[PDB]
Design a protein around this nucleic acid. Sequence first.
RNA 1: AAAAUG
RNA 2: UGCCAGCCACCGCGGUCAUACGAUUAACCCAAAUUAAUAGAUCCACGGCGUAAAGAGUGUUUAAGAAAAAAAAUCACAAUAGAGUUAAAUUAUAACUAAGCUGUAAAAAGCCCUAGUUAAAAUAAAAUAACCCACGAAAGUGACUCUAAUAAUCCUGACACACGAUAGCUAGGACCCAAACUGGGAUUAGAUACCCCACUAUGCCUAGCCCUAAACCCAAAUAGUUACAUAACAAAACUA
Lengths: 135, 177, 99, 58, 86, 97
Amino acid sequence: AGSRLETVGSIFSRTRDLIRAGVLKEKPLWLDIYNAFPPLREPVFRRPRLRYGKAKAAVQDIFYHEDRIRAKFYSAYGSGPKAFDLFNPNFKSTCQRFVEKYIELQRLGETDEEKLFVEAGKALLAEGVTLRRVG
Amino acid sequence: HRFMEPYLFGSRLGQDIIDLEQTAAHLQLALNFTAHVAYREGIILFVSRHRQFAHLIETTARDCGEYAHTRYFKGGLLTNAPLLLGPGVRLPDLIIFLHTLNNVFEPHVAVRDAAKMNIPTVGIVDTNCNPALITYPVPGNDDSPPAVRLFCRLFQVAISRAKEKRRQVEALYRLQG
Amino acid sequence: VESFASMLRHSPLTQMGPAKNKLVIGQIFHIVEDDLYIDFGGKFHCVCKRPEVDGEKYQKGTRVRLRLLDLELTSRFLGATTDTTILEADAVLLGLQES
Amino acid sequence: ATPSLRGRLARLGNPRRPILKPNKPLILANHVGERRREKGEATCITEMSVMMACWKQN
Amino acid sequence: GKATERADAFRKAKNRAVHYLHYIERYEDHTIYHDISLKFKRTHIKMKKQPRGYGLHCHRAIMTICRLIGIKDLYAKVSGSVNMLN
Amino acid sequence: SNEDLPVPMENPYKEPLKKCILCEKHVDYKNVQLLSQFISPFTGCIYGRHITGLCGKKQKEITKAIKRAQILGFMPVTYKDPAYLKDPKVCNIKYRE
RNA sequence: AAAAUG
RNA sequence: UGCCAGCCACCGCGGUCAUACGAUUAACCCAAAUUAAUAGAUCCACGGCGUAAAGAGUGUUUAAGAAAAAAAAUCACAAUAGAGUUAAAUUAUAACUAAGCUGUAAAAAGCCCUAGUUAAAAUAAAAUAACCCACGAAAGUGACUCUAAUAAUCCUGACACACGAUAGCUAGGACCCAAACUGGGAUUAGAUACCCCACUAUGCCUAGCCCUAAACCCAAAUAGUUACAUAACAAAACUA
Ligand SMILES: [Mg+2]
Ligand SMILES: [Mg+2]
Ligand SMILES: [Mg+2]
Ligand SMILES: [Mg+2]
Ligand SMILES: [Mg+2]
Ligand SMILES: [Mg+2]
Ligand SMILES: [Mg+2]
Ligand SMILES: [Mg+2]
Ligand SMILES: [Mg+2]
Ligand SMILES: [Mg+2]
Ligand SMILES: [Mg+2]
Ligand SMILES: [Mg+2]
Ligand SMILES: [Mg+2]
Ligand SMILES: [Mg+2]
Ligand SMILES: [Mg+2]
Ligand SMILES: [Mg+2]
Ligand SMILES: [Mg+2]
Ligand SMILES: [Mg+2]
Ligand SMILES: [Mg+2]
Ligand SMILES: [Mg+2]
Ligand SMILES: [Mg+2]
Ligand SMILES: [Mg+2]
Ligand SMILES: [Mg+2]
Ligand SMILES: [Mg+2]
Ligand SMILES: [Mg+2]
Ligand SMILES: [Mg+2]
Ligand SMILES: [Mg+2]
Ligand SMILES: [Mg+2]
Ligand SMILES: [Zn+2]
């Protein structure tokens, strides 16, 4: 009839070897599509063993240089007056405007953090957004 | 999950982000495999245990002309077919998982039974899913309404195009002689 | 062709940073007799209480202002290999699209 | 706040003497215990006393 | 197969054994590809690749299993527990 | 070649750690007014961590200071001094309901 | 509180 | 025949119920050999030590062994040994009040030189803090103060050296309280037990012994890994 063993291996191997041995005399329709377009990983069963000791996951945290400016903005003024709109793909926030000012102030040859911070804070007033510093 | 490490881009302040490069690379093969089974007159069944969008799954399956299972999965459904469904039935040739986990946060019954019965399984696997048994896993999001609607529309059009092009291929077959 | 690193760097969620005490716009997509299902749009849908003021003005599709507390409420317990996912988010109601 | 659990139980990696010795494994169960029914007690012994005071005096 | 009656148990075992079928890679259809030293629950099995002239000098149950499989030339030694299921 | 890849650097959003009320303070055995806030007014017991809310060092230091002052002749053991009874409430224990 | 054996 | 006669290498068989006892037929294997007994050859561990036998109560060291790639040493809190001090309770002892106090499921016995309150040395022990997890090699240590002080520029290692809870022995001192033993009172058919009361050895200090524990966290020491991989349970499986 077939092979109902999961831990032995993948379904493709268990169909192909059955047909090679001659037990399954009828080709399943999906075998040809598997042969034509195989997936990236063979669907073999792998048991989720727990990770003990000093071993740790290999995923690396997502952090950019703009996060350093965003942390200062949120520490000084907190959340911006313009509420965040996650539906808009091209939405730019007050913190985004602040970091866009910060990068150009860096390109202007300014190395001091106070100069990069207060000048951007005052420059935002030119466009006319309200900054609410948290005391 | 421990087996989602290669399918992730990183972690954004505790929340893990799935990279979409391998998501699209997997989804191309997933849609191609789904469309080929429909082209070759195969039974395709949408298994999904999630009590938020189940109505949307039956609507999508009915519009596709394929079958759906979004309710409580019985024990010997896929294994004890000659008893649960009828005397002699035809097993589904392809299983689409929109939610690999049930309401208990355990792996679904059908992902194990399809591997037991040598039934191809294509599935949207979240960061807490187990892709070891799914033949065609696609790392994505199954809890967002826009994501699940996108996946349902993609799998709807993949079946629709496959069936229609089968009809024009048969039409040309009739004119061949 | 735009790369995922490039669009994720400019994604609004990346610009938001931490989700603690952040003002967001959400849209209500489901209504219960007293509970409102508001989709702020990040990953999950938060559930809020209908206020006493202008309670009749909350309908399906209404846009409201939220002060986000957590993107996803998960925590660890005794003898648990993974977290216990609540499939929801934490947020409070402030207003309804004041404009 | 929940009491700490690090270095309490006896394990291979624990170098020190075990602190807590669980009767049963500290695994959080899926069902809480059924609420206890309170034990009853006699009522108005105080008023029975003043009732019997009339009888002992009169 | 387990049943109240022996004939019913035989029938159940026969009908349930087909559903779980393995494929054994046999080098030149007479012997295994390479020597295998396997540690099960409590049963140690050491099996060595054997020539064409060395026919099934194995345990009395491994000989039957390999006769059903198609292996004609093999040597096996079992140590530890000798439980049939394991 | 991508310039938008994440860079492996320290967390900028790392909030400062919570401090006990007496971090970087000087605990003394002669300051009966300070020592009295951590003892019960009716019985005189020394409150625990779940009541006071102090990080690990200052709890042991305040316990040692109370025990030293109770025997050196500065603070009563059985009760809290009524002179210091009107101090601001730092403990998180509520008796009268 | 009490209370053995087959 | 019927637990009788009797048979067997192990399991075991003997029911007016025997393919296992005695006889007949039949059958199987050897063969001028066939059985029985005794000797032999072979057969234990290059395997394990939490629950089956096994990690020795602890540390150091001699002999001896491995140094195979590179790093380290040392900080809140109750180690230990001396010296000094006592916050609560308890008691010897006085004063006022009462005839009862203690005792258990209930009683009895005991004490009425008894009980409550106000004052009170000596001895013993060290509430909360402690939902803390530190010190010491282990045993062990958490009332306060002072002194001395917690080896190794840090591998393993005894039958050698030094410690080693409580219990027990000797000499001197102490004795509030607790209590083996003992004597009374309960329950029981019996109770030389569990229940109540009194008291002794003992628990306390100095000096000298004894060297035992479920000395268990039943998991040996040193540097490691999360690769293969769940006998069962339990604290996951493993390397040199
Ligand atoms: Mg999900
Ligand atoms: Mg130690
Ligand atoms: Mg137990
Ligand atoms: Mg239980
Ligand atoms: Mg055997
Ligand atoms: Mg008798
Ligand atoms: Mg005979
Ligand atoms: Mg015989
Ligand atoms: Mg005979
Ligand atoms: Mg052995
Ligand atoms: Mg043993
Ligand atoms: Mg030991
Ligand atoms: Mg011993
Ligand atoms: Mg001394
Ligand atoms: Mg005296
Ligand atoms: Mg009497
Ligand atoms: Mg004390
Ligand atoms: Mg040292
Ligand atoms: Mg040594
Ligand atoms: Mg001793
Ligand atoms: Mg002694
Ligand atoms: Mg005495
Ligand atoms: Mg006594
Ligand atoms: Mg007696
Ligand atoms: Mg001990
Ligand atoms: Mg032992
Ligand atoms: Mg050793
Ligand atoms: Mg089992
Ligand atoms: Zn502090």
